[PDB]
């Protein structure tokens, strides 16, 4: 047989990237996964090169990043790639997840695939938070303060967990040094989780836009999808480049260009954009404990979809009601984000509480009710007795 198939190392490459049978009809929405691997690589490479010039001590962290920006040859390119890349990593992840939601990718036999994906999402959010704290700007200090405090809501031992996470009385040197060490570690755990994600993907293969079997017409990954992936890889790089070179700070917060101050929390404090919908959810609950529980539940509820989707067909392509409510969900999510960016004021507080309800109602009420109705509609529209 060909060497690519006989060699122990190359056969892995062959089965995953060359001869892997792909359903002939997958569309550009199936290009997000490769884009995520590319994002992971960009974050790791740029972070290691910057680590070479970074000091984690709380007294030097902010200046060491300014040093990367001013004195390191091409340093600003590395930092801007890393920062803007993190944002692009989230934009693509949301699209990858939304694609799964729309096409019923979370369904059997891909439940394990979906569950591992949820874990990766949690780890990615934690990784970005740890990195954000390393800059040690104003948003870094308060973000670290607020987020480590999320654990104080745990009854009895909560405050002990926080003092342990901090390594002291408050967010200080011990805190930033351990957050940098952890920021360096997690990306590699994410890499291992991605391999487990690809392993689950390999046993059943990708799904397709029709939601039915792809077994009757497959085409090799090599050539077709390798070059098709190339198309979105360049488009992705072009757009990332426009931000990195022409508008590098548009997706960030001006307060992070101010060294962290333990005695003053800016009135302008706003979480990173990709965290806004979750932030809004927490803010909508006027209780400390319930606020943090509901926010975490907003992520874990994604695990419920394989069970609440009662439909007999995979995906929303041929489902009028499901398509409509899917978009209600998407735009409701964007609203949650817009609410997160707003002040805790009158119209906003109530809108956030209603949007929060709609968010949970989608998975727990709308999908099971609507999918059941659609099941019945499909039946009575053709059975003549």
């Amino acid at each position: 047989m060909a060497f690519r198939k006989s060699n122990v190392y190359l056969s892995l490459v062959n089965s995953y990237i060359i001869d892997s049978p792909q359903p002939s009809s997958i569309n550009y929405w199936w290009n997000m996964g490769s884009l995520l691997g590319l994002c992971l690589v960009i974050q790791i490479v740029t972070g290691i090169f910057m680590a070479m010039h970074y000091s984690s001590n709380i007294e030097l962290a902010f200046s060491s990043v300014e040093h990367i920006m001013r004195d390191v040859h091409n340093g600003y390119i590395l930092r801007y790639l890393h920062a803007n890349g993190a944002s692009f990593f989230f934009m693509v992840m949301f699209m990858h997840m939304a694609k799964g939601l729309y096409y019923g990718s979370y369904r059997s036999p891909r439940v394990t695939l979906w569950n591992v994906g949820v874990i990766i999402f949690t780890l990615t959010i934690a990784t970005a938070f740890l990195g954000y704290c390393c800059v040690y700007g104003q948003m870094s200090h308060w973000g670290a303060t607020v987020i480590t405090n999320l654990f104080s809501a745990i009854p009895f031992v909560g405050n002990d967990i926080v003092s342990w996470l901090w390594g002291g009385f408050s967010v200080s040197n011990p805190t930033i040094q351990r957050f940098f060490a952890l920021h360096y570690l997690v990306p590699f755990i994410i890499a291992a989780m991605v391999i487990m994600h690809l392993m689950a993907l390999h046993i059943h293969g990708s799904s397709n836009p029709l939601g039915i079997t792809g077994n009757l017409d497959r085409i090799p990954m090599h050539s077709y999808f390798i070059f098709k992936d190339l198309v979105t890889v360049f488009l992705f790089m072009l757009i990332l480049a426009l931000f990195v070179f022409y508008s590098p700070n548009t997706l960030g917060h001006p307060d992070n260009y101010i060294p962290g101050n333990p005695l003053v929390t800016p009135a302008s404090i706003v979480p990173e954009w990709y965290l806004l919908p979750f932030y809004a959810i927490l803010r909508s609950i006027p209780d400390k404990l319930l606020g943090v529980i509901t926010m975490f539940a907003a992520i874990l509820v994604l695990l419920v979809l394989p069970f609440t989707d009662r439909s007999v067909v995979r995906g929303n392509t041929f489902k009028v009601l499901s398509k409509f409510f899917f978009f209600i969900f998407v735009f409701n999510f964007v609203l949650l984000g817009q609410i997160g960016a707003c002040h805790v004021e009158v119209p906003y507080v109530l809108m956030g509480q209603i949007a929060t309800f709609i968010y949970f109602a989608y998975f727990l009420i709308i999908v099971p009710v609507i999918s059941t109705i659609e099941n019945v509609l499909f039946y009575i529209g053709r059975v003549n007795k």
Binding site: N215, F327, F331
Partner: protein, 93 residues
């Protein structure tokens, strides 16, 4: 090697699909085809069709949310202006 669990996808030669018979396919080398320039005049009016069926599913939920957003924002602006400081004290606490 070690026994592998049954799945819903095999490999070339045993994909796991049903036995096919009666279907005949035809194709022509990309080399023998008209170089990329014909995707117009014949493939232009045909396009844009796969969004004429979908835009309503996107637009209506979008409209509902944009309106809801605009309304709440304009109301907040009123509440914090001179004219609305009376209503503000009412709806606030």
């Amino acid at each position: 090697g070690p026994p592998s669990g049954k799945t819903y996808m095999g490999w070339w030669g045993h994909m796991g699909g049903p036995k096919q018979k009666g279907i005949t396919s035809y194709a022509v080398s990309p080399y023998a085809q008209k170089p990329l320039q014909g995707i117009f005049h014949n493939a232009v009016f045909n396009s844009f069709r796969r969004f004429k069926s979908q835009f309503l599913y996107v637009l209506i939920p979008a409209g509902i949310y944009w309106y809801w957003w605009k309304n709440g924002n304009e109301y907040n602006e009123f509440l914090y202006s001179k004219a609305g400081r009376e209503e503000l004290e009412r709806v606030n606490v």
